[PDB]
Amino acid sequence: MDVLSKGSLKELLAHLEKTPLEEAISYRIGTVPYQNVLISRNEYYNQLYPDTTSLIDGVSREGQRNVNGLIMSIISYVVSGSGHYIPNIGFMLLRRSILDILTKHDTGLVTNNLNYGIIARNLTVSKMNCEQRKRMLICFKLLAYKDGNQNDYEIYLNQNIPLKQIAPNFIPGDMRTVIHNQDQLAIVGIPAYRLTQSTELSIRDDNAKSYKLGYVDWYNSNSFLRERSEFNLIRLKDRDTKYGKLNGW
Amino acid sequence: ANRATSAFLDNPHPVGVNYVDEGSRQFVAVAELLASKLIDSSRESDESNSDVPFVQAYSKFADDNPRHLRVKTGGKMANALTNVIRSYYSINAPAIVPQVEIDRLASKATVSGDMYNSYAIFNSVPIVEVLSPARTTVSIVGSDRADVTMLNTGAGAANITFNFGQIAETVILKGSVPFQLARLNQPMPAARFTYKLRPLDGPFIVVLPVGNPLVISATAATRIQVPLAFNKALVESGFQTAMNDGLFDIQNVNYYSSFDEFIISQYHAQDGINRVSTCVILGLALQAYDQMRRALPV
Amino acid sequence: ANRATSAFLDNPHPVGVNYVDEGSRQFVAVAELLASKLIDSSRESDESNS
Amino acid sequence: ANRATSAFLDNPHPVGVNYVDEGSRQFVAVAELLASKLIDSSRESDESNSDVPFVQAYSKFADDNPRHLRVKTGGKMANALTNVIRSYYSINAPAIVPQVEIDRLASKATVSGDMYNSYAIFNSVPIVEVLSPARTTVSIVGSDRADVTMLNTGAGAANITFNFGQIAETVILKGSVPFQLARLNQPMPAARFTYKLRPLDGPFIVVLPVGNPLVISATAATRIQVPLAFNKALVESGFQTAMNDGLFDIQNVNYYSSFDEFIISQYHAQDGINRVSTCVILGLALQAYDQMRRALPV
Amino acid sequence: ANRATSAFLDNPHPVGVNYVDEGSRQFVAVAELLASKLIDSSRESDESNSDVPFVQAYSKFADDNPRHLRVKTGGKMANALTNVIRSYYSINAPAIVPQVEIDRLASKATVSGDMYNSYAIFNSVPIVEVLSPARTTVSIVGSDRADVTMLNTGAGAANITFNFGQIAETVILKGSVPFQLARLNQPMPAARFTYKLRPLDGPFIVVLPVGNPLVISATAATRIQVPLAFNKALVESGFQTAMNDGLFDIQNVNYYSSFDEFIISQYHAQDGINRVSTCVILGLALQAYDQMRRALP
Amino acid sequence: AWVTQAYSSGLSQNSIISLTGNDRTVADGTFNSMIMPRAVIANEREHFMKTRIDKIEHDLNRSAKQEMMDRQSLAEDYNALNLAVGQEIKLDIATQHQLNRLGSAMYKADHERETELTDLINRIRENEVTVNGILENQKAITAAERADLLLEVVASTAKSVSAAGRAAADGSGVVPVFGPSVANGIKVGIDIADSVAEAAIAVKESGIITQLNDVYHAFQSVHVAPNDVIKPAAVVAGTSTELIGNLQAIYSRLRSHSDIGFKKATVGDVIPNSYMIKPVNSTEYASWQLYVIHPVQGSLGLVVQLMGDALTYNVFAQYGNTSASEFGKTVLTGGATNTALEGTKVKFQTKVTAQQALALTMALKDAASMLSQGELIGYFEQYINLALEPDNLSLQDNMHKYHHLLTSQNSPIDWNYHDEEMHKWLDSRKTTNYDAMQKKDGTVIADIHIPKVFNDLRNTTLHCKLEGKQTIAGYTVYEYLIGPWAHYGDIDYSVVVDTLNEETKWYCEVIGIDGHLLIEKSVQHKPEKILELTVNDSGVTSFNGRNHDRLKLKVYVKDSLSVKVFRNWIGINAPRVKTKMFNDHIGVKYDYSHFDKNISPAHLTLTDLGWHTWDQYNAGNWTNIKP
Amino acid sequence: ASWQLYVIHPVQGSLGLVVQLMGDALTYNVFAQYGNTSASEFGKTVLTGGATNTALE
């Protein structure tokens, strides 16, 4: 819910630096993806509504115990709000931040062999929306510059024209690019339209709506930080300053 | 020629490699300290006709107030303590405790997770192998006190080779009848009833006269570094409780009658020093589990 | 007529004859009391920051 | 003809290319200052019947207050220094310690980080090439003092060509019996016991008579820029301690008995003037490791 | 089968057994501390025009104020140090100085008597045994660096076994020409100039060709626990001074060229572990003796 | 999904290390991914192609055209043996000719393996002092390295122990029988409706029933080289005597199973074939594979189920399958295996015995968690379908220890009970089939399709074509090892020699522990009844006053084309002796060192013929009687 | 962290080759096939391309 509320490249990247990798993984076994299922949607129909389980739903699913599965779980957390079930990774990797896993060689993970075609295919990209695609392209760009595969990233974008049109423009090593970027990456927020407490047919839409109504409850709760009222109560380390920049950028 | 070995020294399964860091070791120590206070508070509350000492102890341990009509499991600490025990036993047991939960629980008390402050003596006897020539039968029974029964059917006196490993410090051998024992390439002394040997000295040769069977009773002592709070009596009871409770039901693992046999068997295995460090942490975890479960049965 | 005996009962060696007076007995009792306080204090320091 | 060469001049392995910048040089200088204060603090602690002088020194070095029942290891600075030493020896070392940690530890004290303030004299003698004709035997033994035993079994006198390199400053040649030595294509002088030569001058010719062996003992001096806090006695002690502790155990490397042999050998390679810079920083790191480890034994 | 051994490793004589208790250890530490202050004060008085720094340090050391007419000997502390050193070298030496005087002198200054809170590196290379075939000649010369010169005159190549003991931590071998060396029952590698060996591995086999003599230079490093006040330069200077001053001239003893040879030879005996405890204490006593003798006329 | 810290201890708790690390991912194109095992049954390309190579080997060594051309000669030779009524083999019958082709090829490979074991035992005994030195001194080294050391210290004549080396040095008579090639282009289904005419019987006699066709199409033979058996034998041996006992113990078991395999075709029932079940979806998140092994040369099957990373197995009896289920009762359990799983079924032929397949399954189950799924499948499918030992040395060592245990006297499976029971089941099945066919059609038709002559592989009177490569003074020597025997009774051996010369004299000698017989004959194109034997219950024979377990028969002939040795038991269905074990083989000892001695026919004289002992001859020159 | 070592003894040739692959570095040595009669299968190196270790385990 917190990750899905980030609306800018600065806020999203700042959140990924603070959060550790254990948030990306989940310890609930869940079910398996790519399975045709019959779910119950009684507000609309009496029969059982068919659908297909995927990795993009907000429910935890069993994942493969490899580097490919780890990256899919990280991107799933960013674009959906929940990750997968990959246990016994190791406390050394789980303490490090999501950004460090994505763009630092010191962690020890090897991601050079990863192919963006199957990752996009597995993390079903024909079913994503514009905001979800932009976040995935951010993760691909961060990984590509980590292993020096910028040329491969460009060729992949040139093959898929719609991805190129919405691809965010920022250099992973430069902080000026993050500041200048004005893409909207928010999947949840205060809605201008009328948001009701009703169900949606698809698994993806129902889970997304639950996060949206959950954010409204959290926005009006006591855990939210109203800057206009209590800006002098935050500590100096976490106060918003223009001089602030990501570590190593 | 025939060889025989102790039953409990065969095929030690790999132990878990999670929750062995500094913060995780502090969590087990915190659980041990707080589980002990739960036991003492129960005795004090019962003897002082007031339940207020128990409420404070349980609230600190479980992070919620004790209420009637509730099972009184122990809160998040009981769940975390139970799961870390399962991960310690086997390397295929999933580690499903978040690092945030470990740090949050470890901050309840100010303890040092140093697991090398003190030592403990373990009495399991590691008979690695006994080599016997033809027409001689050798049988090994027991782990706390090993009884080796040897019979010499052949015409001449035979030589039985004893190998006690290189980990144990002292092995005391007593026989039903006086017998002759000496190291390799050494004069055989007069027959005596008892022998004290250092396992690092080398393979030992025992002469076996033809006739009535000879039974040798072996008692060993080994020293392993343990934290100061370690208590062998509490660990043994907790080990039995965990096996009964089903914490060790993971597939493809070995089962042992006691923690003494478990810790020694892992020591007599490849990367024994690293294994023993994990087994010691499991021991302190099992001691906290025994105190807590006795205070709060489910 | 054969004879069998327990191994640990054969040939007990003589024990020491010094440090058996009352003054020595007090030393052992004092040492035990102070040793018990030592290990208890060591446990207390491990459970505290002092 | 035959060729003879010094044993320690064969195949100098490449050295590390990390932790050479100004920030890293500051960290090494900070470590040497703080490690030195540790030794004098302990001496002052013993003489003053109080552990307070040692407590303050260890708290600054280790960023952790010492405890009686807890082992003292040096903290992060001890780990960073150990990992830095490994990186310097070979280009194949992992070089795991980060740069943010290096900057934090460098801020503990104010030092120049100057690697070229002063100089030192190194006494290893490099004998690159000894050419001997047939029917003669030449053997070279020694690193601090090189003894060249040559025996002529021919009919007439033989000419032996010496080559001491172009790096050493002065070489003093002493013979068991008086001998004749001169330049290439230069007349011979009368027989003398001792010679002072500059290696840059050129290859030298020694006239070897027939019948009795001649042994030449050579001692050389070379000047290398080093920090002003350099101490040859401490560096050599640190070199042996690091070798025993296993910090130099890496595949495809050479091993040297003395630090003078190490620094001179790399100074004779093709890129020697760049290799010495890393060698000098490594020597000061070994100085800190010597003082730190003696005050805090493992 | 011929045998060759290092000269300094043969027949280590037993060391003294007195003055090893905690009270005596404090005496050596106190003597070293006060001797160091004495020489420092002597330097200060030479660089100034006042003898006040010297009279303060000498009075502390000798319990009597210095006088121009009387000679400066060091007092009872100097006498105690000399007799203590004599007893440490051999078991035959008398332990003349009593224990009441030792306890009194230890009370002059406050220092911990622990002699095992640090370590020192010693460079004496022990070659316990070199076994050679019949038709070969092997000579071992040197203590700090050992040169093993070997000549093979047989029909074929020979195998020579090296035994460096079980005490040395590491050994570095260098040869005049590249040579082959491998452990017992390992394959022989290619010819190399250098080798780094762990003596605990076991006997090492080298292959001697027939052609030309091969010389091997051996360096070793062993670690011995010492007090933090240990100084090898001061100890070695004290060893030469004690030998020249005739503190080691008693019947049925061995003589060594350095303190490195003395402590390594003792550590390689049957009772070596208990012997170095006395030898380390003697080393600190020599350091105090060197500093006191140099400062006093 | 796992990283390690630099400058850390390299030791790990587990003894078997996977090529793919704990992350369970290998970058393609790296060395680690190149040395990974390949799935042969699962991959359609490798399974399709492997069958092509095996077919080529069978066709190159045994040609269908050659076998059909030699049918007429073989029928005449088999008639020349005057056998009592009810015991003659009539090769004019189509069905009887088929079983002879399978029997002859199977027996020759088994016979050649026994010969190689005999020379190996001879070489081991010659170097007893140095063999015992290697076995005692080295024990921490791998079994493969120990096998290499043993084969080097002896004149093994085959030093290589690897699978590539074994295939490099292998005779033409060893290649396994490929069933589909034998049954190609052979008439099935002759319909003679209520016609007892002599012409109607002749055409029906020329065809086979469809049941025989299915049996051949699901038949493949297994023959284990002595070099592969040395690793299980030397893994725990402490002396040469123990090692020789293990080698003979294993080949006794392989002897019994090979005999059992042939009886399955003779009985008259369709033999089942091994198969693998894979999920329908190739890109499945949840992966499972099931292997059902039906060894034709054996009495116990194996079902291996790999569900995720968990391996379970079950050993089942191949007898007593009265119910509709193919599997009989299970004798050894290793978990729960579900044989009702739905998926694609792929048929394959195993090239390893039940013991070897079981040995690897136990080893994989021990290292279920240490190895990845690809490695578990690759190692198992390579061994089952290619007889290729795994590259993982630690895994290979564990397999051979289990292979020894299943063979030794402490085996969890008591093989003698199952092998005996399978024999009783097979003969009962044959009786039921014959009487069932006797009711449906005439008694003459029943004898045509299911013959009672053949029965067991060694009970059946078979011929063994010999190959000769050694010629001395123009006389080529042909070797044939008489014995050992799994049955007792009276047995006759005959020799047929055809050569280009119109007349010639050929000599046959029979070597025992004492001396040779030196028969001399001159007949051609007809068996000669060279030697006749009697066999005890224990399988031993009193040959010329000395108990023997095997003999060496050598035939010398000039300018020969083909030499065949025939064998026939006097009584039909000779009872079988108990299969020997480790204790039986080390209890008694015979010397085969005398089998390498050979004579020179060219320098022979009349007085030299007859039974002569070694003392009569001098040192060397075993042809001339004067010492 | 893998290393490969290849030793080629061409039966139809007068010289041999030893190729070693250590990481991203390739080193080779061409050796004479004659005169190696002293406890070694390699003669003198007629052409050197680096350092090759034949004692690898």
Side-chain angles (χ1 to χ4, degrees), chain D residues 34 37 55-64 77 107-109:
Chain D
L34 291 206
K37 270 174 186 186
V55 158
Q56 312 181 220
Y58 184 91
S59 291
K60 192 159 200 10
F61 192 82
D63 263 358
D64 153 32
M77 189 125 59
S107 64
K108 279 166 150 330

Side-chain angles (χ1 to χ4, degrees), chain D residues 6-289:
Chain D
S6 281
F8 69 101
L9 281 192
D10 190 275
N11 259 20
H13 66 278
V15 296
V17 286
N18 277 94
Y19 309 125
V20 156
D21 54 282
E22 204 49 73
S24 292
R25 301 195 285 227
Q26 223 156 311
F27 160 68
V28 169
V30 163
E32 204 277 310
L33 208 185
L34 291 206
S36 85
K37 270 174 186 186
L38 250 198
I39 270 167
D40 289 345
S41 81
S42 157
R43 312 274 254 261
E44 224 282 317
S45 178
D46 280 20
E47 83 189 49
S48 150
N49 218 31
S50 55
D51 326 293
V52 177
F54 176 78
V55 158
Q56 312 181 220
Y58 184 91
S59 291
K60 192 159 200 10
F61 192 82
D63 263 358
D64 153 32
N65 289 337
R67 313 273 316 222
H68 272 111
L69 312 161
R70 295 176 64 186
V71 62
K72 293 129 211 219
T73 51
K76 325 285 283 321
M77 189 125 59
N79 252 33
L81 201 62
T82 320
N83 296 321
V84 157
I85 280 164
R86 304 205 218 227
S87 179
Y88 277 140
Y89 204 62
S90 94
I91 207 151
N92 305 329
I96 71 199
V97 47
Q99 189 72 0
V100 163
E101 208 98 40
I102 287 295
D103 280 352
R104 194 194 100 254
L105 294 157
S107 64
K108 279 166 150 330
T110 80
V111 285
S112 61
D114 222 19
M115 275 330 130
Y116 322 115
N117 244 0
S118 84
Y119 59 98
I121 301 267
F122 290 100
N123 50 9
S124 157
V125 63
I127 313 188
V128 178
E129 214 148 339
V130 178
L131 276 35
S132 34
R135 299 180 58 72
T136 63
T137 89
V138 170
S139 295
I140 315 188
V141 47
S143 289
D144 54 0
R145 160 165 72 73
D147 326 291
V148 191
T149 285
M150 328 152 302
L151 182 62
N152 189 16
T153 36
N159 283 343
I160 310 276
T161 280
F162 276 84
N163 187 38
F164 291 102
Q166 300 149 7
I167 303 301
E169 274 121 32
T170 83
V171 187
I172 309 281
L173 268 69
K174 261 176 232 311
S176 46
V177 303
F179 62 108
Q180 278 174 89
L181 172 138
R183 326 248 316 281
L184 218 76
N185 283 333
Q186 219 78 357
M188 300 269 119
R192 305 161 20 200
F193 260 118
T194 165
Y195 287 92
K196 168 150 145 313
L197 328 166
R198 62 180 295 241
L200 198 71
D201 202 303
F204 310 99
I205 299 266
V206 178
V207 159
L208 193 55
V210 279
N212 201 66
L214 170 61
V215 196
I216 295 169
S217 295
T219 302
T222 320
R223 214 201 308 271
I224 286 174
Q225 313 219 251
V226 285
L228 215 173
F230 213 71
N231 193 310
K232 275 234 310 161
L234 290 164
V235 165
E236 287 283 345
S237 185
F239 194 75
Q240 315 303 318
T241 301
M243 214 161 246
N244 299 328
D245 263 16
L247 311 189
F248 297 166
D249 306 344
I250 283 199
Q251 206 44 253
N252 263 247
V253 312
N254 253 284
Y255 299 103
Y256 305 106
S257 64
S258 193
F259 179 75
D260 301 29
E261 298 167 28
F262 171 62
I263 191 161
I264 292 305
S265 184
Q266 315 261 18
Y267 202 111
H268 276 73
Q270 52 268 82
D271 42 314
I273 191 66
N274 317 333
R275 301 218 202 171
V276 63
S277 295
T278 315
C279 293
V280 165
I281 309 168
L282 169 60
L284 201 57
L286 294 173
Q287 216 192 279
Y289 181 105

Side-chain angles (χ1 to χ4, degrees), chain B residues 90-125:
Chain B
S90 182
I91 200 173
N92 321 316
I96 58 172
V97 183
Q99 307 283 296
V100 202
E101 209 37 73
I102 289 307
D103 298 38
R104 208 191 45 86
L105 293 166
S107 90
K108 291 173 165 322
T110 166
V111 302
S112 84
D114 200 24
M115 308 266 136
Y116 308 93
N117 296 335
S118 204
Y119 66 93
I121 305 277
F122 294 89
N123 303 305
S124 283
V125 52

Side-chain angles (χ1 to χ4, degrees), chain E residues 159 179-183 186-191 195 205-207, chain G residues 39 54-55:
Chain E
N159 280 11
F179 69 104
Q180 333 204 15
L181 164 142
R183 218 176 337 156
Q186 289 46 19
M188 215 77 35
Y195 287 95
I205 288 62
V206 63
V207 169
Chain G
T54 326

Side-chain angles (χ1 to χ4, degrees), chain B residues 33 110-112 117 174-175 193 228-229, chain C residues 7-8 10 39 42-43 46-49:
Chain B
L33 197 186
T110 166
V111 302
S112 84
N117 296 335
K174 314 218 270 293
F193 260 121
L228 251 169
Chain C
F8 72 103
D10 175 0
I39 181 137
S42 302
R43 289 203 230 251
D46 197 270
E47 297 148 7
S48 206
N49 291 126

Side-chain angles (χ1 to χ4, degrees), chain A residues 41-92:
Chain A
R41 289 276 130 81
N42 219 233
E43 150 174 351
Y44 301 108
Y45 302 113
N46 276 319
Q47 33 162 329
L48 299 143
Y49 187 84
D51 211 53
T52 325
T53 57
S54 64
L55 292 182
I56 283 321
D57 326 304
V59 200
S60 159
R61 300 277 201 268
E62 252 170 312
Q64 307 187 303
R65 333 280 271 251
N66 41 10
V67 171
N68 217 331
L70 191 43
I71 292 312
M72 293 204 258
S73 167
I74 286 158
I75 306 179
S76 293
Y77 167 71
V78 175
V79 315
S80 178
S82 148
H84 306 330
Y85 179 59
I86 309 126
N88 289 61
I89 294 185
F91 80 98
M92 294 300 293

